Protein backbone atom coordinates (compact mmCIF):
# COMPACT_ATOMS: atom_id res chain seq x y z
CA UNK A 1 0.00 0.00 0.00
CA UNK A 2 2.97 2.29 0.64
CA UNK A 3 4.39 1.70 -2.85
CA UNK A 4 1.31 3.33 -4.38
CA UNK A 5 1.88 6.34 -2.10
CA UNK A 6 5.53 6.59 -3.21
CA UNK A 7 4.46 6.25 -6.86
CA UNK A 8 1.89 9.03 -6.36
CA UNK A 9 4.57 11.21 -4.75
CA UNK A 10 6.93 10.48 -7.66
CA UNK A 11 4.19 11.41 -10.14
CA UNK A 12 3.49 14.61 -8.18
CA UNK A 13 7.14 15.71 -8.12
CA UNK A 14 7.42 14.80 -11.83
CA UNK A 15 4.36 16.95 -12.56
CA UNK A 16 5.90 19.78 -10.52
CA UNK A 17 9.13 19.45 -12.51
CA UNK A 18 7.12 19.49 -15.75
CA UNK A 19 5.33 22.66 -14.58
CA UNK A 20 8.73 24.19 -13.78
CA UNK A 21 10.07 23.22 -17.21
CA UNK A 22 6.98 24.75 -18.83
CA UNK A 23 7.59 27.95 -16.86
CA UNK A 24 11.24 27.83 -17.98
CA UNK A 25 10.41 27.49 -21.68
CA UNK A 26 7.69 30.17 -21.31
CA UNK A 27 10.29 32.53 -19.81
CA UNK A 28 12.64 31.50 -22.64
CA UNK A 29 9.99 32.41 -25.23
CA UNK A 30 9.91 36.04 -24.01
CA UNK A 31 13.52 36.66 -25.07
CA UNK A 32 12.99 36.37 -28.83
CA UNK A 33 11.70 39.30 -30.84
CA UNK A 34 8.27 39.16 -32.52
CA UNK A 35 8.41 37.90 -36.09
CA UNK A 36 5.20 39.52 -37.36
CA UNK A 37 4.76 42.23 -39.99
CA UNK A 38 2.75 45.45 -39.98
CA UNK A 39 0.03 46.36 -42.48
CA UNK A 40 -0.02 48.60 -44.41
CA UNK A 41 3.43 49.62 -43.14
CA UNK A 42 5.52 46.49 -43.91
CA UNK A 43 4.12 44.88 -47.06
CA UNK A 44 5.48 41.59 -48.36
CA UNK A 45 7.43 41.30 -51.61
CA UNK A 46 5.46 39.41 -54.30
CA UNK A 47 7.46 36.65 -55.98
CA UNK A 48 7.72 36.08 -59.73
CA UNK A 49 5.41 33.04 -59.45
CA UNK A 50 2.66 34.63 -57.32
CA UNK A 51 -0.17 35.56 -59.67
CA UNK A 52 -2.86 38.23 -59.52
CA UNK A 53 -5.03 40.35 -61.81
CA UNK A 54 -5.37 39.53 -65.51
CA UNK A 55 -4.09 42.30 -67.79
CA UNK A 56 -5.46 42.51 -71.34
CA UNK A 57 -4.01 44.32 -74.35
CA UNK A 58 -6.12 45.77 -77.16
CA UNK A 59 -3.25 45.88 -79.69
CA UNK A 60 -1.82 42.33 -79.76
CA UNK A 61 -5.20 40.64 -80.13
CA UNK A 62 -6.77 38.79 -83.06
CA UNK A 63 -10.04 37.52 -81.44
CA UNK A 64 -9.32 33.84 -82.10
CA UNK A 65 -11.50 32.50 -79.21
CA UNK A 66 -8.96 29.97 -77.93
CA UNK A 67 -8.61 30.85 -74.23
CA UNK A 68 -12.41 30.81 -73.78
CA UNK A 69 -12.49 27.02 -74.24
CA UNK A 70 -9.59 26.62 -71.79
CA UNK A 71 -11.55 28.43 -69.06
CA UNK A 72 -13.96 26.12 -67.17
CA UNK A 73 -16.48 28.95 -66.68
CA UNK A 74 -15.71 30.86 -69.95
CA UNK A 75 -15.42 34.26 -68.26
CA UNK A 76 -13.61 36.34 -70.96
CA UNK A 77 -16.18 37.18 -73.63
CA UNK A 78 -15.28 37.99 -77.24
CA UNK A 79 -17.56 40.53 -78.95
CA UNK A 80 -16.31 40.01 -82.50
CA UNK A 81 -18.00 41.28 -85.67
CA UNK A 82 -17.53 40.35 -89.32
CA UNK A 83 -16.24 43.08 -91.63
CA UNK A 84 -16.78 42.89 -95.39
CA UNK A 85 -13.96 45.29 -96.30
CA UNK A 86 -11.25 43.14 -94.70
CA UNK A 87 -11.01 39.34 -94.53
CA UNK A 88 -10.65 38.85 -90.74
CA UNK A 89 -12.63 39.75 -87.62
CA UNK A 90 -12.09 42.61 -85.18
CA UNK A 91 -12.72 42.87 -81.44
CA UNK A 92 -15.29 45.44 -80.28
CA UNK A 93 -15.61 44.94 -76.50
CA UNK A 94 -13.80 42.82 -73.91
CA UNK A 95 -15.35 42.13 -70.50
CA UNK A 96 -14.53 39.67 -67.71
CA UNK A 97 -16.07 39.13 -64.27
CA UNK A 98 -13.74 38.75 -61.30
CA UNK A 99 -16.15 37.65 -58.55
CA UNK A 100 -16.41 34.15 -60.03
CA UNK A 101 -12.74 34.02 -61.05
CA UNK A 102 -10.67 31.13 -59.72
CA UNK A 103 -7.29 32.92 -60.24
CA UNK A 104 -5.41 29.84 -61.44
CA UNK A 105 -3.70 31.44 -64.52
CA UNK A 106 -4.69 28.77 -67.05
CA UNK A 107 -5.81 31.01 -69.94
CA UNK A 108 -2.47 32.86 -69.86
CA UNK A 109 -0.47 29.66 -70.50
CA UNK A 110 -2.39 28.63 -73.65
CA UNK A 111 -1.66 31.82 -75.56
CA UNK A 112 0.89 32.00 -78.42
CA UNK A 113 0.84 35.79 -78.83
CA UNK A 114 0.92 36.45 -75.00
CA UNK A 115 -2.24 38.56 -75.11
CA UNK A 116 -2.91 38.06 -71.38
CA UNK A 117 -0.53 39.11 -68.62
CA UNK A 118 -0.11 38.58 -64.88
CA UNK A 119 -0.41 41.72 -62.73
CA UNK A 120 0.63 41.90 -59.06
CA UNK A 121 -2.69 43.22 -57.71
CA UNK A 122 -4.49 41.59 -54.78
CA UNK A 123 -5.94 44.68 -53.01
CA UNK A 124 -9.46 44.45 -54.44
CA UNK A 125 -12.21 45.52 -52.02
CA UNK A 126 -15.46 46.98 -53.35
CA UNK A 127 -18.76 47.78 -51.64
CA UNK A 128 -20.74 46.49 -54.65
CA UNK A 129 -20.22 43.52 -56.97
CA UNK A 130 -21.80 44.94 -60.14
CA UNK A 131 -18.63 46.81 -61.18
CA UNK A 132 -16.52 43.64 -61.52
CA UNK A 133 -17.03 43.50 -65.31
CA UNK A 134 -13.70 45.18 -65.99
CA UNK A 135 -13.15 46.99 -69.29
CA UNK A 136 -10.02 46.54 -71.41
CA UNK A 137 -8.98 50.17 -70.86
CA UNK A 138 -9.38 49.53 -67.12
CA UNK A 139 -7.20 46.40 -67.34
CA UNK A 140 -4.63 48.31 -69.41
CA UNK A 141 -3.51 50.47 -66.48
CA UNK A 142 -0.18 50.51 -64.64
CA UNK A 143 0.21 48.15 -61.64
CA UNK A 144 1.02 49.48 -58.18
CA UNK A 145 4.67 48.93 -57.26
CA UNK A 146 5.48 48.15 -53.63
CA UNK A 147 9.00 49.58 -54.03
CA UNK A 148 8.14 53.09 -55.29
CA UNK A 149 5.72 53.76 -52.40
CA UNK A 150 7.77 55.66 -49.78
CA UNK A 151 5.33 54.93 -46.93
CA UNK A 152 5.66 51.13 -46.92
CA UNK A 153 8.67 49.11 -45.78
CA UNK A 154 9.80 46.33 -48.15
CA UNK A 155 10.47 42.96 -46.53
CA UNK A 156 11.09 39.68 -48.34
CA UNK A 157 9.65 36.27 -47.50
CA UNK A 158 11.44 33.18 -46.17
CA UNK A 159 12.71 31.89 -49.53
CA UNK A 160 14.21 35.24 -50.62
CA UNK A 161 17.02 35.42 -48.05
CA UNK A 162 20.79 35.16 -48.69
CA UNK A 163 22.58 31.98 -47.50
CA UNK A 164 19.79 30.97 -45.11
CA UNK A 165 18.07 33.27 -42.60
CA UNK A 166 15.46 32.00 -40.15
CA UNK A 167 14.07 35.43 -39.16
CA UNK A 168 14.22 37.57 -42.30
CA UNK A 169 13.47 40.96 -40.78
CA UNK A 170 16.73 42.92 -40.50
CA UNK A 171 18.42 42.14 -43.87
CA UNK A 172 21.59 44.27 -43.53
CA UNK A 173 23.07 43.20 -46.89
CA UNK A 174 21.76 43.60 -50.42
CA UNK A 175 22.09 39.99 -51.54
CA UNK A 176 19.17 37.85 -52.69
CA UNK A 177 18.37 34.57 -54.50
CA UNK A 178 20.65 32.31 -52.43
CA UNK A 179 22.66 30.21 -54.87
CA UNK A 180 24.06 31.35 -58.22
CA UNK A 181 22.52 32.87 -61.33
CA UNK A 182 23.32 30.81 -64.48
CA UNK A 183 25.45 33.48 -66.17
CA UNK A 184 28.73 33.58 -64.21
CA UNK A 185 29.04 29.77 -64.31
CA UNK A 186 29.55 30.02 -68.08
CA UNK A 187 32.19 32.72 -67.50
CA UNK A 188 34.28 31.04 -64.79
CA UNK A 189 33.62 27.36 -65.52
Amino acid sequence: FLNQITNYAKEAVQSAKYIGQGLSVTFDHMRRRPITVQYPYEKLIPSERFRGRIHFEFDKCIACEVCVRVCPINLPVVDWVFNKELKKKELKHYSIDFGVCIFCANCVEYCPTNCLSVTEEYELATYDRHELNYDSVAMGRIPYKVTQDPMVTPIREFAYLPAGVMSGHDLPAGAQRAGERPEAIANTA
Binding site: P34, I35, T36, V37, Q38, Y39, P40, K43, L44, P72, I73, D97, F98, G99, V100, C101, I102, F103, Y122, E123, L124, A125, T126, Y127, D128, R129, L132
Partner: protein, 200 residues
Protein backbone atom coordinates in the same frame (compact mmCIF):
# COMPACT_ATOMS: atom_id res chain seq x y z
CA UNK B 1 -41.50 53.91 -69.29
CA UNK B 2 -38.09 53.45 -71.02
CA UNK B 3 -36.27 53.07 -67.65
CA UNK B 4 -36.09 49.61 -66.08
CA UNK B 5 -35.89 49.24 -62.26
CA UNK B 6 -36.24 52.92 -61.25
CA UNK B 7 -34.87 54.46 -58.06
CA UNK B 8 -37.24 56.52 -55.94
CA UNK B 9 -36.09 59.93 -54.73
CA UNK B 10 -35.76 60.42 -50.93
CA UNK B 11 -29.57 71.77 -41.52
CA UNK B 12 -27.35 72.93 -38.64
CA UNK B 13 -25.53 70.79 -36.08
CA UNK B 14 -23.62 71.42 -32.86
CA UNK B 15 -19.94 70.92 -32.11
CA UNK B 16 -20.43 68.95 -28.88
CA UNK B 17 -22.84 66.52 -30.57
CA UNK B 18 -20.32 66.19 -33.42
CA UNK B 19 -17.54 65.34 -30.95
CA UNK B 20 -19.82 62.84 -29.18
CA UNK B 21 -20.57 61.24 -32.56
CA UNK B 22 -16.82 61.09 -33.28
CA UNK B 23 -16.28 59.34 -29.92
CA UNK B 24 -19.18 56.94 -30.61
CA UNK B 25 -17.76 56.09 -34.04
CA UNK B 26 -14.19 55.79 -32.70
CA UNK B 27 -15.33 53.24 -30.09
CA UNK B 28 -16.87 51.03 -32.79
CA UNK B 29 -13.76 51.55 -34.93
CA UNK B 30 -11.49 50.54 -32.04
CA UNK B 31 -13.36 47.50 -30.70
CA UNK B 32 -14.69 45.78 -33.88
CA UNK B 33 -15.48 42.37 -32.39
CA UNK B 34 -15.75 39.75 -35.18
CA UNK B 35 -17.34 36.29 -35.47
CA UNK B 36 -15.46 33.25 -36.81
CA UNK B 37 -17.71 31.30 -39.19
CA UNK B 38 -16.05 29.03 -41.74
CA UNK B 39 -16.84 25.74 -43.49
CA UNK B 40 -13.88 25.34 -45.88
CA UNK B 41 -10.26 26.41 -46.52
CA UNK B 42 -11.27 30.07 -46.14
CA UNK B 43 -11.57 29.31 -42.42
CA UNK B 44 -7.96 28.09 -42.55
CA UNK B 45 -6.97 31.31 -44.34
CA UNK B 46 -8.73 33.27 -41.59
CA UNK B 47 -7.03 31.19 -38.87
CA UNK B 48 -3.65 31.85 -40.50
CA UNK B 49 -4.17 35.52 -39.60
CA UNK B 50 -4.79 34.70 -35.92
CA UNK B 51 -1.32 33.15 -35.73
CA UNK B 52 1.84 35.09 -34.93
CA UNK B 53 2.81 35.89 -38.52
CA UNK B 54 0.27 38.51 -39.67
CA UNK B 55 -1.07 39.60 -36.23
CA UNK B 56 -4.77 40.10 -36.93
CA UNK B 57 -5.30 40.75 -33.19
CA UNK B 58 -3.43 44.10 -33.27
CA UNK B 59 -6.31 45.99 -34.88
CA UNK B 60 -8.57 45.10 -31.93
CA UNK B 61 -10.32 42.03 -33.38
CA UNK B 62 -10.51 39.14 -30.90
CA UNK B 63 -11.78 35.63 -31.78
CA UNK B 64 -15.19 34.83 -30.29
CA UNK B 65 -17.32 31.74 -30.88
CA UNK B 66 -20.50 33.52 -29.67
CA UNK B 67 -22.94 34.97 -32.26
CA UNK B 68 -24.21 37.45 -29.65
CA UNK B 69 -21.14 39.52 -28.64
CA UNK B 70 -19.92 40.20 -32.19
CA UNK B 71 -20.75 43.34 -34.18
CA UNK B 72 -19.33 41.84 -37.40
CA UNK B 73 -19.85 38.46 -39.08
CA UNK B 74 -17.36 36.98 -41.55
CA UNK B 75 -19.01 34.43 -43.82
CA UNK B 76 -16.51 32.24 -45.68
CA UNK B 77 -16.67 29.08 -47.78
CA UNK B 78 -18.96 27.27 -50.18
CA UNK B 79 -22.50 27.70 -48.86
CA UNK B 80 -25.04 24.91 -49.26
CA UNK B 81 -28.77 25.75 -49.28
CA UNK B 82 -29.17 23.45 -46.27
CA UNK B 83 -26.82 25.84 -44.42
CA UNK B 84 -28.64 28.98 -45.65
CA UNK B 85 -31.35 29.07 -42.89
CA UNK B 86 -28.55 28.34 -40.40
CA UNK B 87 -26.67 31.40 -41.67
CA UNK B 88 -29.91 33.43 -41.63
CA UNK B 89 -30.56 32.50 -37.98
CA UNK B 90 -26.91 33.16 -37.04
CA UNK B 91 -27.21 36.60 -38.65
CA UNK B 92 -30.56 37.34 -36.98
CA UNK B 93 -29.41 36.27 -33.50
CA UNK B 94 -26.65 38.89 -33.60
CA UNK B 95 -27.28 42.37 -32.13
CA UNK B 96 -28.52 45.20 -34.31
CA UNK B 97 -25.27 47.13 -35.11
CA UNK B 98 -23.89 44.28 -37.22
CA UNK B 99 -21.68 44.26 -40.31
CA UNK B 100 -21.08 41.67 -43.03
CA UNK B 101 -17.75 40.86 -44.70
CA UNK B 102 -18.00 38.17 -47.38
CA UNK B 103 -14.64 36.55 -48.13
CA UNK B 104 -14.17 34.30 -51.14
CA UNK B 105 -15.19 33.85 -54.77
CA UNK B 106 -17.86 31.23 -54.03
CA UNK B 107 -19.28 33.44 -51.26
CA UNK B 108 -19.82 36.79 -52.99
CA UNK B 109 -21.04 35.15 -56.24
CA UNK B 110 -21.41 31.56 -57.50
CA UNK B 111 -17.65 31.07 -57.83
CA UNK B 112 -16.55 27.90 -59.58
CA UNK B 113 -19.90 26.26 -58.72
CA UNK B 114 -21.90 28.49 -61.08
CA UNK B 115 -21.73 26.41 -64.29
CA UNK B 116 -23.08 22.95 -63.33
CA UNK B 117 -24.39 23.01 -59.76
CA UNK B 118 -27.70 22.41 -57.99
CA UNK B 119 -26.80 22.74 -54.28
CA UNK B 120 -24.34 25.64 -53.90
CA UNK B 121 -25.82 29.07 -53.21
CA UNK B 122 -24.80 31.53 -55.93
CA UNK B 123 -24.14 34.58 -53.77
CA UNK B 124 -24.42 35.37 -50.07
CA UNK B 125 -25.93 38.80 -50.87
CA UNK B 126 -29.18 36.92 -51.55
CA UNK B 127 -29.06 35.86 -47.87
CA UNK B 128 -27.37 38.65 -45.87
CA UNK B 129 -26.72 42.31 -46.85
CA UNK B 130 -23.02 42.46 -47.74
CA UNK B 131 -21.26 45.73 -46.91
CA UNK B 132 -17.75 44.99 -48.22
CA UNK B 133 -17.15 42.34 -50.87
CA UNK B 134 -13.85 40.47 -51.22
CA UNK B 135 -13.01 38.67 -54.48
CA UNK B 136 -10.35 35.98 -54.53
CA UNK B 137 -10.12 32.18 -54.67
CA UNK B 138 -8.55 32.18 -52.10
CA UNK B 139 -7.77 35.84 -51.31
CA UNK B 140 -4.55 37.03 -49.72
CA UNK B 141 -4.67 37.74 -45.96
CA UNK B 142 -3.39 41.22 -46.83
CA UNK B 143 -6.52 41.53 -48.98
CA UNK B 144 -8.60 40.51 -45.94
CA UNK B 145 -6.84 43.24 -43.95
CA UNK B 146 -7.57 45.65 -46.83
CA UNK B 147 -11.25 44.65 -46.59
CA UNK B 148 -11.03 45.33 -42.84
CA UNK B 149 -9.56 48.76 -43.67
CA UNK B 150 -12.39 49.49 -46.13
CA UNK B 151 -14.94 48.35 -43.54
CA UNK B 152 -13.35 50.75 -41.04
CA UNK B 153 -13.60 53.49 -43.66
CA UNK B 154 -17.29 52.59 -44.12
CA UNK B 155 -18.23 52.48 -40.41
CA UNK B 156 -17.31 56.16 -39.86
CA UNK B 157 -19.93 57.20 -42.47
CA UNK B 158 -22.75 56.59 -39.98
CA UNK B 159 -24.64 59.36 -38.17
CA UNK B 160 -26.13 59.84 -34.71
CA UNK B 161 -29.23 61.70 -35.95
CA UNK B 162 -29.88 59.25 -38.80
CA UNK B 163 -29.71 56.26 -36.46
CA UNK B 164 -33.31 55.28 -37.24
CA UNK B 165 -32.49 52.66 -39.88
CA UNK B 166 -31.47 49.55 -37.88
CA UNK B 167 -34.92 48.00 -37.54
CA UNK B 168 -37.41 45.80 -39.39
CA UNK B 169 -41.00 46.72 -40.23
CA UNK B 170 -43.94 44.43 -39.48
CA UNK B 171 -45.93 44.04 -42.77
CA UNK B 172 -47.73 41.01 -41.33
CA UNK B 173 -50.11 38.83 -43.34
CA UNK B 174 -52.20 35.85 -42.23
CA UNK B 175 -53.50 33.17 -44.60
CA UNK B 176 -54.52 29.52 -44.40
CA UNK B 177 -53.31 26.48 -46.34
CA UNK B 178 -54.48 22.93 -47.06
CA UNK B 179 -51.28 20.91 -46.68
CA UNK B 180 -51.08 17.37 -45.28
CA UNK B 181 -49.36 16.54 -41.96
CA UNK B 182 -45.89 15.05 -42.38
CA UNK B 183 -44.37 12.23 -40.31
CA UNK B 184 -41.48 13.40 -38.11
CA UNK B 185 -37.81 13.18 -39.00
CA UNK B 186 -35.31 10.81 -37.37
CA UNK B 187 -33.76 12.07 -34.11
CA UNK B 188 -31.08 9.63 -33.06
CA UNK B 189 -32.05 5.93 -33.30
CA UNK B 190 -28.86 4.62 -34.91
CA UNK B 191 -27.24 1.94 -32.73
CA UNK B 192 -30.15 0.42 -30.77
CA UNK B 193 -32.37 0.00 -33.85
CA UNK B 194 -34.66 -3.05 -34.24
CA UNK B 195 -33.48 -3.58 -37.84
CA UNK B 196 -29.76 -3.38 -36.98
CA UNK B 197 -29.08 -6.20 -34.50
CA UNK B 198 -31.85 -8.46 -35.81
CA UNK B 199 -31.28 -9.29 -39.51
CA UNK B 200 -34.51 -9.15 -41.57
Amino acid sequence: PAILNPIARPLAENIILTSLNDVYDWARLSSLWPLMYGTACCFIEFAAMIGSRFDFDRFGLVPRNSPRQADLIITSGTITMKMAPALVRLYEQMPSPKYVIAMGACTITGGMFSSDSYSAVRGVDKLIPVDVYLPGCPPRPEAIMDAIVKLRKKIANEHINERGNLAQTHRLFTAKHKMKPVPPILTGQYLNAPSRQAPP
